[PDB]
């Protein structure tokens, strides 16, 4: 039934005087493939709807929350497009020249520019990751922080009842907040950047957003644990448990 | 002191030797230095007993002298055999510096625990004696005792002792604000992932949105003066009520509105000297950043005999806005 739902959007595209509802309905739809994290769904109907929609259909409480979802909703899919590419480099990091204990003389100088080419590649495998870092992290800033009401939440107060998408606009904050927050733990110590890793605990708690209500109890205590984990290597480093110098 | 550096002597040439022996013979010399060694320790042992009260400064300083030697035999014993280490230690009855790094460069977690059965303070020696410097994790899971609570409290799934003592460090804390703010924000999330009645849990997040209260003021500091006075972002001290305040207000603090005032005018509850002095230092700025607006907004916001006035001009629409400022107020 995938195709019946993302075929729908094509029928509504191609009549332009029906944009809003066009994406009114590529947003429930994938507001459905988010729920099953189905980002490969969610981003095939992503495109589909053209790239200058926003544009043209400049506002009733249903079209402005539509165009506030929908870029919600871009956030959302560039905080895992650019995580899979740091990732799979995470993951091919060069590697040690192999060691040919008792070499011959020959094999003692092809091995010291071996070692000397991987020391190369491995300063370069931490330079594309950090840059790789460096715009991972920001995506994951833009979903966490969303600006103006925070992610999924509506700004326009003065739609009809829609119990359906209001629920669901619940729901995707509860299954997609933690597990993006975990995501960037995940990056931040897989970095090394362990002070930032605590500071997720004033993100989350923050009033600001309320982060901390999307939480179920189990969950935060995972994160208690997670930040805990950061910490130590923190002292490893001589510093105290946050990161600030012993004086 | 002839006699004891003849025997320091024979130390280091019976330490240049073993460099070059036949096992066994290597430690018959050992266990005749270490044979040596404790009747030198002994004997400034029994000095010291002899020795005590007034004229201490002279009997502390000969202490140390003895404490860099029962180190100079212990590194010497650093490389040599470690079976003799629990004589050497038991032979000057303390020295557990060097007992105790000996436990430690071993998996003997046995041995540092029967150095501990057998000792009067020394948990509270081996402790300090670890921060100082996998299973040491065992030994953290002990040392994480004190500050470092907490962390020990979080994977005992103590969480609601971690959010008391993480209050407790955040309310301490005045040397880093970035850190006093983590602290709280972590406390917060703890007691939230606790287990509190919802009673409870609704009183610790009360009395904490206070807290979260008062510095959101420090907090919101305008990004103008803080380049001004060349602050650090965030490697900036915990600062209360008084600085806040003046800095506020400082001609510095450029685009000072309505909203600047307010808030310093909010702190002044965050005090614990002259509270009316400033209630006037304040709204005097607030008339000469006017160049006779703000003062009519700030008016605008409070909702009154707070405010002073002949004292004040200590002047056409002070006294005019102050009689649709008595209509205001009645």
Redesign the interface.
Known sequence: EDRLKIDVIDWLVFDPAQRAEALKQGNAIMRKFLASKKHEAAKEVFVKIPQDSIAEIYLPAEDDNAIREHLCIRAYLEAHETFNEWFKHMNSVPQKPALIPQPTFTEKVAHEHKEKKYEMDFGIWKGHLDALTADVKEKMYNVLLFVDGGWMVDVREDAKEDHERTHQMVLLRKLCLPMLCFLLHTILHSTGQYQECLQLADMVSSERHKLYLVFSKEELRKLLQKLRESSLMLLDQGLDPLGYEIQ | RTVIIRQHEIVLKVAYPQADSNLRNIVTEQLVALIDCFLDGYVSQLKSVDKSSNRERYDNLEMEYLQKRSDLLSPLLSLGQYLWAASLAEKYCDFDILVQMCEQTDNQSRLQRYMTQFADQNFSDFLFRWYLEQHGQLANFLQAHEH?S??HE??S?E?EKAHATLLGLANMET??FA?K??????S???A??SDFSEDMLQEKIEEM?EQ?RFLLHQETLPEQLLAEKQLNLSAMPVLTAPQLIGLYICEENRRANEYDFKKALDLLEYIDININDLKLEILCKALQRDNWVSKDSIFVKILLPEVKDLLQADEFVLKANYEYYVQGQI
């Open positions: 470092l907490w962390l979080i994977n799934q969480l040397r880093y850190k703010k983590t602290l709280l924000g972590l917060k999330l703890a939230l992932a949105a979260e």
